[PDB]
Amino acid sequence: ASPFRLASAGEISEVQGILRTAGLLGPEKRIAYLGVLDPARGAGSEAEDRRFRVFIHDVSGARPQEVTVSVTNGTVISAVELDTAATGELPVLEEEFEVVEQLLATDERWLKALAARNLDVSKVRVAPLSAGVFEYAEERGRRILRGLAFVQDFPEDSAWAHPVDGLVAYVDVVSKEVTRVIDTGVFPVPAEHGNYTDPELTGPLRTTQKPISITQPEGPSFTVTGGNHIEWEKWSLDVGFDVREGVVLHNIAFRDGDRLRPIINRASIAEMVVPYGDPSPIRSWQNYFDTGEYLVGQYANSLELGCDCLGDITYLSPVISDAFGNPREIRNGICMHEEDWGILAKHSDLWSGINYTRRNRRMVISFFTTIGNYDYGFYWYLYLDGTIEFEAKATGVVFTSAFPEGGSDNISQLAPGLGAPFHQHIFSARLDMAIDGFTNRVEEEDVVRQTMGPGNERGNAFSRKRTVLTRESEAVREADARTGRTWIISNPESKNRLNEPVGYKLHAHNQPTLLADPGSSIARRAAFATKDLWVTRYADDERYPTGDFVNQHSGGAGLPSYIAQDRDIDGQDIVVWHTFGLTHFPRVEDWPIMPVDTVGFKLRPEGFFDRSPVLDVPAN
């Protein structure tokens, strides 16, 4: 009966039937996005109304539609025709992944470029790459994908080892036409294979690893009710899943004695972009919004027990829609388990003689997705002491190129003749805050150094300063690692026992933000990525930092347009948007399959509790 329950197969089937009965889902239509809408503010009526939002693509070239359906009442609430030249194209369809290669295989320009390189067309894979917005006027309002080619020597061969540099093609996937084929010159196709399961490359497998057995003989300490409601060590939350964002956390709260205290209303990774820093015209257009353009939830992996998730695992199997509105289950797509996390608190006292040790643990909610060459793990952690942490784990195969004769300032060499262009992976966490309720504010906290002098005669004093962000126009902030800058989200109307406002402190990793020139296309389309922290006033329709339709959108949508409203955020219903990313200069050790690298952020209580919240943890 919870409004935050996962979508069920029956709900998706009903959406299909409603759209069919309304005349919106004929044979030429494809569902590009389908997801459940969150309850509006003030759902204290408890009148169940499950609403779904659908993006409908038309393969015959008619305008696509955005539709909102009530599955409870069996009605279409609104349907609007989209002008994609204005507001953006729809996300990439899975069925379009193979279209780029198929169309190019019969194009005489493509075939002539392959013949010059003595490449058999049957062996050439073409990646279906989002196009962005650049100088090609004919692409405005057309659904375009670009293609880069990789050779597969045999069906199980890793094509990433064999990039075909100097060659790129653009395709209109609706009219089924190749618009441009660009050949800037012949580069040798790197010949070494990258087959990480080939014994010739791995050598004999290690025999030295002894098993690590992790079991819970009495079962786990958390409970799951209503399909997706979790209770664990005073935490309470709902685990949602959306085909665009992936795992979404709702209603994160902490049971402090008798009171269930809210902390975060909704937490998600609302966008992620991979900009490339190679100025070659073959690749200088590459910026993949893995979330906004491709939808990371739909490519979530089925996670295997003992391999992907180790220990006493509870799985969720979310249901999504296929392109025709049929339900599709992602079996074992979400892993949930608790983990030991070392020492929580420890002291041996020289005067009382008491020796005290307690252990920590964390609840893990995770999924893993695969977008072409990239594989990303998304991990949310809840700790006994009130800390919330997010971690992204980046792995997969690096996107490759040729390595030019005489080297490169923008590409790493991985193997003879094989390069990997510099790039970033930049995430946006959208944190709809609810610190003890919805009346919240954000303060920026810097360390303050003090000069030796009167009142500081020994030159040892240091302090801190807090600046309240009062309006959206002043709430676009940069990191400053040297001054220890953090941000505090507090509730000015809820005080702890010392009469101080309760709060949580956001600790960033202070990694570089978007490196591209501020006048570039990507700086305008991924404006969120140029600053570490944004604060907006909550609004139902302000969901993504890049806007609703990211694919081939010209720029400025999302956060820069939201904050122009200059709304009051001092003790209001607010949303924190945190940018954080990895800057990847590929190393030889990343090849032929990359070991995990990580980035994230965490939030820690800051006078939220009246004392340590883990005094009642028993001594193991």
Annotated binding residue at 297? Answer: yes
Ramachandran region, residue 181 (left: φ > 0; alpha: ψ -120 to 50; beta: rest): beta
584 binds, among Cu ion, Na ion, its own copies, none (CB under 5 to 8 A by kind): Cu ion
Minimal CA–CA distance to 429: which of 392, 472, 459?
A: 392
β-pairing, 144-151 with 235-242? unpaired
Annotated catalytic residue: which of 33, 276, 374, 544?
A: 374
The least distance separating Na ion from the CB of residue 363, rounded to whole angstroms, comes to 23
At position 179, the amino acid (one-letter code) is T
The least distance separating Cu ion from the CB of residue 425, rounded to whole angstroms, comes to 6
Annotated catalytic residue: which of 38, 242, 290, 590?
A: 290
Contact 420, 591 (CB under 8 A): yes
573 binds, among Na ion, Cu ion, its own copies, none (CB under 5 to 8 A by kind): Na ion
Residue closer to its own copies (CB basis): 25 or 303: 303
374 is catalytic: yes
**DSSP states of 505-568 as a string?**
EEEE-------S-TTSHHHHHTGGGGSSEEEEE--TT---TT-S--TT--S-TTHHHHHTT--B
The least distance separating Cu ion from the CB of residue 378, rounded to whole angstroms, comes to 16
Annotated binding residue at 179? Answer: no
554 binds, among Na ion, Cu ion, its own copies, none (CB under 5 to 8 A by kind): Na ion
Separation of alpha carbons 110 and 480, rounded Å? 49
21 binds, among its own copies, Na ion, Cu ion, none (CB under 5 to 8 A by kind): none
Maximum distance among all alpha carbons in the chain?
87
Separation of alpha carbons 68 and 87, rounded Å? 18
Strand order in the sheet with 388-396: 314-316, 334-348, 355-371, 374-383, 388-396, 594-606, 501-508, 486-495, 441-449, 462-468
- Residues 544-603 binding Cu ion (CB under 5 A) are 584
Separation of alpha carbons 85 and 107, rounded Å? 27
Choices 32-40, 51-59, 312-320, 433-441; region in contact with Na ion by CB under 5 A: 433-441
Choices 31-39, 240-248, 557-565, 571-579; region in contact with Na ion by CB under 5 A: 571-579
Residue closer to Cu ion (CB basis): 143 or 584: 584
Residue closer to its own copies (CB basis): 60 or 208: 208
Q: What token pair was written down for 182?
A: 């660009």
Radius of gyration of the chain, Cα coordinates, nearest whole angstrom: 26
> What character string, x for contact with Na ion (CB under 5 A) and - otherwise, covers 529-548?
---------x----------
At position 145, the amino acid (one-letter code) is L
Sign of CA dihedral 165, 529, 424, 547: negative
Annotated binding residue at 374? Answer: yes
Residue showing the smallest CB distance to Cu ion in the complex? 584
406 binds, among Na ion, its own copies, Cu ion, none (CB under 5 to 8 A by kind): none
55 binds, among Cu ion, Na ion, its own copies, none (CB under 5 to 8 A by kind): none
Annotated binding residue at 423? Answer: yes
Separation of alpha carbons 543 and 522, rounded Å? 20
Name which position in 172, 256, 312, 573 contacts Na ion (CB under 5 A): 573
Contact 562, 544 (CB under 8 A): no
Residue closer to its own copies (CB basis): 418 or 475: 418
The least distance separating its own copies from the CB of residue 532, rounded to whole angstroms, comes to 10
Note whether 583 binds Na ion by CB under 5 A: no
Note whether 554 binds Na ion by CB under 5 A: yes
Number of residues that bind Na ion (CB under 5 A): 5
Note whether 283 binds Cu ion by CB under 5 A: no
The least distance separating its own copies from the CB of residue 171, rounded to whole angstroms, comes to 18
Burial tier of 27 (Cβ tally within 10 Å: 0-12, 13-18, 19+): exposed
Residue closer to Cu ion (CB basis): 30 or 584: 584
Annotated binding residue at 152? Answer: no
Residue closer to Cu ion (CB basis): 294 or 538: 294
Separation of alpha carbons 242 and 559, rounded Å? 21
The least distance separating its own copies from the CB of residue 555, rounded to whole angstroms, comes to 13
Name which position in 14, 38, 157, 432 contacts Na ion (CB under 5 A): 432
Contact 57, 173 (CB under 8 A): no
Count the residues in the chain.
620
610 binds, among Cu ion, its own copies, Na ion, none (CB under 5 to 8 A by kind): its own copies
Choices 69-77, 96-104, 169-177, 565-573; region in contact with Na ion by CB under 5 A: 565-573
Minimal CA–CA distance to 579: which of 473, 392, 427?
A: 427
544 is catalytic: no
433 binds, among its own copies, Cu ion, Na ion, none (CB under 5 to 8 A by kind): Na ion
Contact 396, 412 (CB under 8 A): no
The three-state DSSP-derived secondary structure of 412-475 is EEEECCEEEECEEEEEEEEEEECCCCCCEEEEEEEEEECCCECCECCCCCEEEEEEECCEHHHC
Residue closer to Na ion (CB basis): 17 or 571: 571
Residues forming the annotated binding site for substrate?
Answer: 288-299, 371-376
Which residues are annotated as catalytic?
Answer: 290, 374
Q: Which residues contact Cu ion by CB under 5 A? A: 584
Residues forming the annotated binding site?
Answer: 288-299, 371-376, 423, 425, 584
Residues forming the annotated binding site for Cu cation?
Answer: 423, 425, 584
